[PDB]
Amino acid sequence: SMAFKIQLDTLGQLPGIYTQISLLYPVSDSSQYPTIVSTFEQGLKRFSEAVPWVAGQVKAEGISEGNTGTSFIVPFEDVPRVVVKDLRDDPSAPTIEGMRKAGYPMAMFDENIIAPRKTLPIGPGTGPDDPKPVILLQLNFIKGGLILTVNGQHGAMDMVGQDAVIRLLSKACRNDPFTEEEMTAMNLDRKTIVPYLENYTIGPEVDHQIVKADVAGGPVSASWAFFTFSPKAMSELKDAATKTLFVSTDDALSAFIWKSASRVRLERIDGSAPTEFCRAVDARPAMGVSNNYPGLLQNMTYHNSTIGEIANESLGATASRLRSDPASMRQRTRGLATYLHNNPDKSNVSLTADADPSTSVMLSSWAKVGLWDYDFGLGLGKPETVRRPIFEPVESLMYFMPKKPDGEFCAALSLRDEDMDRLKADKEWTKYAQYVG
């Protein structure tokens, strides 16, 4: 019977995480839950029947002397596992009115309560001896609602690929047809999807991506929070960035956050302190790969300055730095992939190798993913919110949520307490950013 051994993307071969994401739906009557679950399970069965590997697990082998191993997607169970957790009567769990009143804070999406597995390899069931399923799902019944949480194994998928998988799952559940293009994209070979450079040694393409003990990157009192930017805030931020330079929405918001973080950081470090902005970029367009490719095809761009310069320059000035193709993206990602491919030990490569947590910003925007459209044939409507679960603070790590269809953005920011406290009290920050927590 059906079997598979799909080598991870070379970019996914960093001995590294589950990416979690949660979708909240209102549920009018508890009479609905049995059909919610069975609709969901039928869709998962259909999807697994269509694309067997989504039900597999990631397994490393080839681990030897100075070889950090190679991971493959290999069989695990018949369908991907859904956990059904009933939290309607759990006094420590969120409720739909609590969510609504608090504006859907990250703290109400506690990974230990609403996720099937932690983000980080921490605690029980995160050993090497433990299976690493490609995908894990959880349906959380809450008072008046449903939280669906999807965990994706990060070596197997970046968020663009995860979005692609979730999207196909939703189609599956809602009896949509699959296109041939989707089935093709879902079955592209991964180990060759980035053409390698011939006779590569080491070049500017892997700047900022090789770990060195004497350079910080790759702990102290900190927290996570969401901040909301209303459609009005966003429109005005774009206006502010244009007046002082075109840049993209993403661009403007990223510059704003770098500046504000730098500004508050002036209070505890000197303006001469270097600062690096690290920005995730989907490499599929530059590679000529489908949006429906489910793997890990992503890089970062790196923008270097000082705390004082970023804080004090204009918004347009900072946004121009972030301006910051395809040629550069293709060349850099090929060099990165080739560098990894030429090295049996991949343990010294990181997309944030030199990003000092004290002064860096490490941003991954999920603003373009399509999660706000997925109903999974549940009869509940579209997600009332789309939020990343809270986990351990990771200083200077940041995400933009998928843009809400009314234009509201949400930034998930993790900062040391000193910085977080000052940001929340900062006049220029709070002009645009509403603390949610």
Coordinates of C-alpha atoms in Angstrom, one line a residue:
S1 CA 0.0 0.0 0.0
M2 CA 0.7 3.7 -0.6
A3 CA 4.1 4.9 0.6
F4 CA 6.3 7.9 0.1
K5 CA 9.7 9.2 1.0
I6 CA 9.7 12.9 0.0
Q7 CA 13.0 14.7 0.8
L8 CA 12.5 18.1 2.4
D9 CA 13.3 21.3 0.6
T10 CA 17.1 21.9 1.1
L11 CA 16.0 25.1 2.8
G12 CA 14.0 23.0 5.2
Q13 CA 17.1 20.9 6.2
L14 CA 18.1 23.1 9.0
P15 CA 18.1 20.8 12.0
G16 CA 15.2 23.1 13.4
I17 CA 9.4 24.2 15.2
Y18 CA 5.7 24.0 14.5
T19 CA 4.0 27.0 13.0
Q20 CA 0.7 27.4 14.6
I21 CA -2.3 29.4 13.4
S22 CA -5.8 29.7 14.8
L23 CA -9.2 30.5 13.2
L24 CA -12.1 31.5 15.4
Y25 CA -15.7 30.9 14.3
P26 CA -19.0 31.7 16.0
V27 CA -21.2 28.6 16.7
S28 CA -24.9 29.4 17.5
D29 CA -26.0 26.1 19.1
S30 CA -24.0 23.2 20.6
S31 CA -26.3 20.9 18.6
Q32 CA -23.9 21.8 15.8
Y33 CA -20.6 20.3 17.0
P34 CA -21.1 16.7 15.9
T35 CA -21.7 17.7 12.3
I36 CA -18.8 20.2 12.6
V37 CA -16.4 17.5 13.5
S38 CA -17.7 14.9 11.0
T39 CA -17.6 17.5 8.2
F40 CA -14.1 18.3 9.1
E41 CA -13.0 14.6 9.3
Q42 CA -14.6 13.7 5.9
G43 CA -12.6 16.6 4.4
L44 CA -9.4 15.4 6.0
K45 CA -10.0 11.8 4.7
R46 CA -10.7 13.1 1.2
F47 CA -7.6 15.3 1.3
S48 CA -5.4 12.5 2.6
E49 CA -6.9 10.2 -0.1
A50 CA -6.0 12.8 -2.7
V51 CA -2.5 13.7 -1.4
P52 CA -1.3 10.8 0.9
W53 CA 1.8 12.6 2.1
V54 CA -0.2 15.2 4.1
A55 CA -0.9 12.4 6.6
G56 CA 2.8 11.6 7.0
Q57 CA 5.5 12.6 9.5
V58 CA 9.0 14.2 9.1
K59 CA 11.8 11.8 9.8
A60 CA 15.6 12.5 9.9
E61 CA 18.1 9.9 8.9
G62 CA 21.8 9.9 7.8
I63 CA 22.9 11.4 11.1
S64 CA 26.6 10.6 11.5
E65 CA 30.0 12.1 12.2
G66 CA 29.8 15.7 10.9
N67 CA 26.6 15.0 9.0
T68 CA 23.6 16.6 10.6
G69 CA 21.2 14.3 8.6
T70 CA 18.5 14.5 5.9
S71 CA 14.8 14.6 6.6
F72 CA 12.0 13.1 4.6
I73 CA 8.3 13.1 4.6
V74 CA 7.4 9.4 5.3
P75 CA 4.2 7.5 6.3
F76 CA 2.7 7.9 9.7
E77 CA -1.1 7.5 10.0
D78 CA -4.0 7.1 7.6
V79 CA -5.3 10.7 8.0
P80 CA -3.8 13.7 9.8
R81 CA -4.8 13.7 13.5
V82 CA -7.5 16.1 14.7
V83 CA -7.8 16.5 18.5
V84 CA -11.2 17.6 19.6
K85 CA -11.0 19.6 22.9
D86 CA -14.1 20.7 24.6
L87 CA -13.4 23.9 26.5
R88 CA -17.0 25.2 26.8
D89 CA -17.0 24.4 30.6
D90 CA -13.3 25.1 31.2
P91 CA -13.2 28.3 33.4
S92 CA -9.5 29.1 32.2
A93 CA -10.5 28.8 28.5
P94 CA -11.6 31.7 26.3
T95 CA -15.3 32.2 25.4
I96 CA -16.6 34.0 22.3
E97 CA -17.9 37.1 24.3
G98 CA -14.6 37.3 26.2
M99 CA -12.7 37.2 22.8
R100 CA -15.0 39.9 21.4
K101 CA -14.6 42.1 24.5
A102 CA -10.9 41.8 24.6
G103 CA -10.3 42.2 20.8
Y104 CA -8.9 38.6 20.3
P105 CA -5.7 39.0 22.3
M106 CA -2.8 36.6 21.8
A107 CA -3.0 35.6 25.4
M108 CA -6.4 34.1 24.8
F109 CA -4.8 31.7 22.2
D110 CA -2.7 29.8 24.6
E111 CA -0.8 27.1 22.7
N112 CA -1.0 24.7 25.7
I113 CA -4.9 24.9 25.6
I114 CA -5.8 25.5 21.9
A115 CA -2.9 23.9 20.0
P116 CA -2.2 20.1 19.4
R117 CA 1.6 20.6 20.0
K118 CA 3.9 23.4 21.2
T119 CA 5.7 25.7 18.7
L120 CA 9.1 24.9 20.2
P121 CA 10.7 21.5 21.0
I122 CA 9.8 22.0 24.7
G123 CA 8.3 19.6 27.2
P124 CA 6.7 16.1 26.8
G125 CA 6.4 14.6 23.4
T126 CA 9.1 16.8 21.7
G127 CA 12.0 14.4 22.0
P128 CA 13.8 13.0 18.9
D129 CA 12.1 9.6 19.6
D130 CA 8.8 11.4 19.2
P131 CA 6.9 11.5 15.9
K132 CA 6.9 14.8 14.0
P133 CA 3.6 14.8 12.0
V134 CA 3.6 16.9 8.9
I135 CA 0.4 18.6 10.1
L136 CA -1.6 18.4 13.3
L137 CA -5.1 19.9 13.8
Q138 CA -7.2 20.8 16.9
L139 CA -10.9 21.7 17.1
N140 CA -11.6 23.6 20.3
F141 CA -15.2 23.9 21.4
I142 CA -15.5 27.2 23.3
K143 CA -18.5 28.8 24.7
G144 CA -20.4 30.1 21.7
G145 CA -17.6 29.3 19.3
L146 CA -15.0 27.1 17.6
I147 CA -11.2 27.6 17.4
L148 CA -9.5 25.6 14.7
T149 CA -5.8 25.4 15.1
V150 CA -3.5 24.1 12.5
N151 CA 0.1 23.1 13.3
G152 CA 2.6 22.7 10.4
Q153 CA 6.0 21.1 10.7
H154 CA 8.3 23.9 9.8
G155 CA 10.9 21.9 7.8
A156 CA 8.0 20.7 5.6
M157 CA 6.3 24.1 5.0
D158 CA 6.7 27.8 5.4
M159 CA 3.5 29.8 6.0
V160 CA 2.8 30.3 2.3
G161 CA 3.0 26.5 1.8
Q162 CA 0.9 25.9 5.0
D163 CA -1.7 28.3 3.7
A164 CA -1.7 26.3 0.5
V165 CA -2.3 23.1 2.5
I166 CA -5.0 24.6 4.7
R167 CA -6.7 26.0 1.6
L168 CA -6.8 22.6 -0.1
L169 CA -8.2 21.1 3.2
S170 CA -11.0 23.7 3.2
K171 CA -11.8 22.9 -0.4
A172 CA -11.9 19.2 0.6
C173 CA -14.2 19.8 3.5
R174 CA -16.5 22.0 1.4
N175 CA -16.8 19.6 -1.6
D176 CA -14.9 21.9 -4.0
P177 CA -13.2 20.3 -6.9
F178 CA -9.3 20.1 -6.9
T179 CA -7.6 21.6 -10.0
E180 CA -4.9 19.7 -11.9
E181 CA -2.6 22.6 -11.2
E182 CA -3.2 22.1 -7.4
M183 CA -2.5 18.4 -7.6
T184 CA 0.7 19.0 -9.6
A185 CA 1.9 21.7 -7.2
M186 CA 1.2 19.4 -4.3
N187 CA 3.4 16.8 -5.9
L188 CA 6.4 18.8 -7.2
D189 CA 9.7 17.2 -6.2
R190 CA 11.3 19.3 -3.4
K191 CA 15.0 18.4 -3.4
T192 CA 15.4 19.9 -6.9
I193 CA 13.0 22.8 -6.8
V194 CA 15.9 25.3 -6.2
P195 CA 18.5 24.9 -9.0
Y196 CA 21.9 24.8 -7.4
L197 CA 24.8 27.0 -8.4
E198 CA 27.8 25.2 -10.1
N199 CA 31.1 25.4 -8.2
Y200 CA 29.9 27.4 -5.2
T201 CA 32.1 28.1 -2.3
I202 CA 30.9 31.1 -0.3
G203 CA 29.7 34.4 -1.4
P204 CA 27.6 37.5 -0.6
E205 CA 24.4 35.4 -1.0
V206 CA 24.8 33.9 2.4
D207 CA 25.8 37.2 4.2
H208 CA 24.0 37.2 7.6
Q209 CA 23.1 33.5 7.4
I210 CA 26.2 31.7 8.8
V211 CA 26.4 31.4 12.7
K212 CA 29.7 32.3 14.4
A213 CA 30.2 32.0 18.2
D214 CA 31.9 35.4 18.4
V215 CA 28.8 37.1 16.8
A216 CA 25.5 37.4 18.5
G217 CA 22.4 35.7 16.8
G218 CA 20.8 32.4 15.7
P219 CA 16.3 34.3 27.7
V220 CA 15.5 37.6 29.6
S221 CA 12.2 39.0 30.9
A222 CA 9.9 39.4 27.9
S223 CA 6.4 39.1 26.5
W224 CA 4.2 38.7 23.4
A225 CA 1.4 41.0 22.3
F226 CA -0.9 41.8 19.4
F227 CA -1.2 45.4 18.3
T228 CA -4.0 46.4 16.0
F229 CA -3.8 49.0 13.2
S230 CA -7.2 50.2 12.0
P231 CA -7.8 50.7 8.3
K232 CA -7.6 54.5 9.1
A233 CA -4.3 54.0 10.9
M234 CA -2.9 52.1 7.9
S235 CA -4.1 54.7 5.3
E236 CA -2.5 57.4 7.4
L237 CA 0.8 55.5 7.9
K238 CA 1.0 55.0 4.1
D239 CA 0.4 58.8 3.8
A240 CA 3.2 59.6 6.3
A241 CA 5.7 57.3 4.6
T242 CA 5.0 58.7 1.1
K243 CA 5.3 62.3 2.2
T244 CA 8.9 61.7 3.4
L245 CA 10.5 59.3 0.9
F246 CA 6.7 54.5 -3.7
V247 CA 6.7 51.9 -0.9
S248 CA 4.3 49.1 -0.2
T249 CA 1.9 48.9 2.7
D250 CA 4.2 46.3 4.1
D251 CA 7.2 48.6 3.7
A252 CA 5.5 51.4 5.6
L253 CA 4.4 49.3 8.5
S254 CA 7.7 47.6 8.8
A255 CA 9.6 50.9 8.8
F256 CA 7.1 52.3 11.4
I257 CA 7.8 49.3 13.7
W258 CA 11.6 49.4 13.2
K259 CA 11.6 53.2 14.0
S260 CA 9.4 52.8 17.1
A261 CA 11.4 49.8 18.4
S262 CA 14.6 51.8 17.8
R263 CA 13.2 54.9 19.4
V264 CA 12.2 53.1 22.7
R265 CA 15.5 51.3 22.7
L266 CA 17.4 54.6 22.8
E267 CA 16.4 54.6 26.5
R268 CA 18.6 51.6 27.3
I269 CA 21.3 51.5 24.6
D270 CA 23.4 54.1 22.7
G271 CA 22.2 55.4 19.3
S272 CA 25.5 54.0 17.8
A273 CA 24.3 50.5 18.5
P274 CA 23.9 48.6 15.2
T275 CA 20.4 47.5 14.3
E276 CA 19.4 44.8 11.8
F277 CA 15.9 44.4 10.3
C278 CA 15.4 40.9 9.0
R279 CA 12.4 40.5 6.6
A280 CA 10.9 37.2 5.4
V281 CA 10.2 37.0 1.7
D282 CA 8.4 34.2 -0.2
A283 CA 11.0 33.0 -2.7
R284 CA 8.3 31.2 -4.9
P285 CA 7.8 34.2 -7.3
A286 CA 11.6 34.6 -7.9
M287 CA 11.9 30.9 -8.4
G288 CA 9.0 30.6 -10.8
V289 CA 7.2 28.3 -8.4
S290 CA 3.4 28.0 -8.0
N291 CA 1.7 29.8 -5.1
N292 CA 0.2 26.3 -4.3
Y293 CA 3.6 24.7 -3.7
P294 CA 3.3 23.4 -0.1
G295 CA 7.0 23.3 0.9
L296 CA 9.5 25.7 2.4
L297 CA 10.7 28.2 -0.3
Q298 CA 11.5 31.4 1.6
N299 CA 14.4 33.7 2.4
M300 CA 15.1 37.0 4.2
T301 CA 16.4 40.3 3.2
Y302 CA 18.7 42.2 5.7
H303 CA 18.8 45.9 6.4
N304 CA 21.5 47.3 8.6
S305 CA 21.8 50.7 10.3
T306 CA 22.1 52.1 13.8
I307 CA 19.5 52.6 16.5
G308 CA 19.9 56.4 16.4
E309 CA 19.8 56.7 12.7
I310 CA 16.6 54.6 12.4
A311 CA 14.9 56.4 15.3
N312 CA 15.6 59.9 14.1
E313 CA 15.3 59.7 10.3
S314 CA 11.9 60.2 8.5
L315 CA 9.4 57.5 8.1
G316 CA 9.8 57.6 4.3
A317 CA 13.6 57.4 4.9
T318 CA 13.3 54.1 6.8
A319 CA 10.6 52.7 4.4
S320 CA 13.0 53.4 1.5
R321 CA 15.7 51.2 3.1
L322 CA 13.1 48.3 3.1
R323 CA 12.2 48.9 -0.6
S324 CA 15.7 47.3 -1.3
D325 CA 14.1 42.5 -7.5
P326 CA 13.4 38.8 -8.3
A327 CA 17.0 38.5 -9.7
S328 CA 18.5 39.2 -6.3
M329 CA 16.0 37.0 -4.6
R330 CA 16.6 34.1 -7.0
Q331 CA 20.4 34.4 -6.8
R332 CA 20.5 34.7 -3.1
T333 CA 18.2 31.7 -2.4
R334 CA 20.0 29.5 -4.9
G335 CA 23.3 30.4 -3.2
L336 CA 21.8 29.6 0.3
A337 CA 20.3 26.3 -1.0
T338 CA 23.6 25.4 -2.7
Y339 CA 25.6 26.3 0.4
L340 CA 23.4 24.0 2.5
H341 CA 23.4 21.2 -0.2
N342 CA 27.3 21.3 -0.3
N343 CA 27.5 20.9 3.5
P344 CA 26.7 17.7 5.4
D345 CA 26.7 19.7 8.6
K346 CA 23.9 22.3 8.3
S347 CA 24.0 23.2 12.0
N348 CA 25.7 26.6 11.4
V349 CA 23.1 28.1 9.0
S350 CA 20.3 30.3 10.3
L351 CA 18.1 32.9 8.6
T352 CA 18.8 35.0 11.7
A353 CA 22.5 34.0 12.3
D354 CA 23.7 37.5 13.2
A355 CA 20.4 39.1 14.3
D356 CA 21.3 40.2 17.9
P357 CA 18.0 39.9 19.8
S358 CA 18.6 43.1 21.8
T359 CA 18.6 45.5 18.8
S360 CA 17.2 43.5 15.9
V361 CA 13.8 43.1 14.3
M362 CA 13.0 39.7 12.9
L363 CA 9.7 40.0 10.9
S364 CA 7.7 37.5 9.0
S365 CA 4.6 39.0 7.4
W366 CA 1.7 36.6 6.7
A367 CA -0.4 39.6 5.4
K368 CA -1.0 38.1 1.9
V369 CA -2.1 34.5 3.0
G370 CA -5.7 33.5 2.2
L371 CA -6.9 32.2 5.6
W372 CA -9.8 34.7 6.0
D373 CA -11.6 32.9 3.2
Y374 CA -11.7 29.4 4.7
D375 CA -15.0 28.1 6.0
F376 CA -14.1 24.3 5.7
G377 CA -17.8 23.6 4.7
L378 CA -18.7 24.0 8.4
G379 CA -21.8 26.3 7.9
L380 CA -20.3 28.8 10.4
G381 CA -19.2 31.5 8.0
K382 CA -15.7 32.8 7.6
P383 CA -13.2 33.2 10.5
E384 CA -14.2 36.0 12.8
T385 CA -10.5 36.3 13.5
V386 CA -7.2 34.8 12.5
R387 CA -4.6 34.8 15.1
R388 CA -1.2 33.1 15.9
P389 CA -1.2 31.3 19.3
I390 CA 1.0 32.8 22.1
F391 CA 4.1 30.7 23.0
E392 CA 7.4 31.5 24.7
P393 CA 8.7 35.1 24.1
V394 CA 11.3 35.3 21.4
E395 CA 12.9 38.7 21.7
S396 CA 12.5 40.8 18.6
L397 CA 10.4 38.2 16.8
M398 CA 7.5 39.7 14.9
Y399 CA 4.6 38.6 12.6
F400 CA 1.9 40.4 10.6
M401 CA -1.4 38.4 10.6
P402 CA -3.3 37.9 7.3
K403 CA -4.8 41.3 6.5
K404 CA -8.4 41.4 7.7
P405 CA -10.7 42.0 4.7
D406 CA -11.8 45.4 6.1
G407 CA -8.0 46.5 6.0
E408 CA -7.2 46.0 9.7
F409 CA -3.6 44.8 10.2
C410 CA -2.3 43.0 13.3
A411 CA 1.3 42.8 14.4
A412 CA 2.4 40.2 16.8
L413 CA 5.5 41.7 18.6
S414 CA 7.7 40.0 21.2
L415 CA 10.0 42.4 23.1
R416 CA 11.9 42.5 26.5
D417 CA 9.7 44.1 29.2
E418 CA 11.6 47.3 29.3
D419 CA 11.0 47.8 25.5
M420 CA 7.4 46.5 25.6
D421 CA 6.5 48.8 28.5
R422 CA 8.0 51.9 26.9
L423 CA 6.4 51.1 23.5
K424 CA 3.0 50.8 25.0
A425 CA 3.4 54.2 26.6
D426 CA 5.0 55.8 23.5
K427 CA 2.9 58.7 21.9
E428 CA 4.1 58.1 18.4
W429 CA 3.5 54.3 18.6
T430 CA 0.0 54.6 20.1
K431 CA -1.0 57.2 17.5
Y432 CA -1.3 54.2 15.1
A433 CA -1.0 51.0 17.2
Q434 CA -3.7 49.8 19.6
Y435 CA -2.4 47.5 22.3
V436 CA -4.4 44.3 22.4
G437 CA -2.2 41.8 24.3

